[PDB]
Structure formats: structure tokens, C-alpha cells
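Appendix B: complex inputs.
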Amino acid sequence: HMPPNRPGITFEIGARLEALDYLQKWYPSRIEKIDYEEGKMLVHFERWSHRYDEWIYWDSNRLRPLE
Amino acid sequence: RSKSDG
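Resulting structure:
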């Protein structure tokens, strides 16, 4: 499947955005992996261990542009 | 830095 177009975000590996972790805190983040079958992405919250990476659907409002 | 407490 193809990712949606959303302003301020590019859905590609290594692209940067802001992402809401499961504690509802925003962090500058990086797209690590994209699952194009499910439409979800592995998001890495910067300066956190990769054990805290989270899978977020690419149309989620847990993702927003990084200014 | 961790994300849970107990």
C-alpha cells in the first residue's frame, strides 16, 4: 500500500517528525521501518533507547510535523 | 531514562 500525503511529513525511512509516545509526550522522532502491508511505521523517539520505539499507523494523529 | 515506575 502507499502512504498518504500529509503536509509537513514525508513517509520515508529516516524522515523526521514529532511523535506522541504512549505516555502522551511529544518527541522529535525518526521513521525506522515502514510496514506497507498494515500501514504502520516503527517510530524512534530520539535520545531514547530503541526498546522504546513504537509502531504507529501512518494516518495517526500521534504523528505531526517537526518544525 | 525509563518510562515506568514500579
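The longest strand of chain A covers residues 26-35.
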